[PDB]
Amino acid sequence: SELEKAMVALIDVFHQYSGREGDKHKLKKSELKELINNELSHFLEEIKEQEVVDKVMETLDNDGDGECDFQEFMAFVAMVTTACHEFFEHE
């Protein structure tokens, strides 16, 4: 059942923050970072300092190299995870 809550769990995160200007379905350095430091204050891992995040969100910048939407963050938690969490999940 986690697959159902975890799935929408991600969506809600972006659907809650992303969508302030009007177009929605996109997140800027302020929308993502703040959110991360907002939801992930004790368990970041994928986000260390403030400067790194900017590069982090940029490392996934696929849309227009401008900001990160739902597809950019979805690939993030997945890319960052699927890679290290793979065998690094232990350490």
Partner: peptide, 12 residues
């Protein structure tokens, strides 16, 4: 992807 973290440039 294993130890490359797969991110891209940030961690490389």
């Amino acid at each position: 992807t294993r130890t490359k973290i797969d991110w891209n440039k940030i961690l490389s």
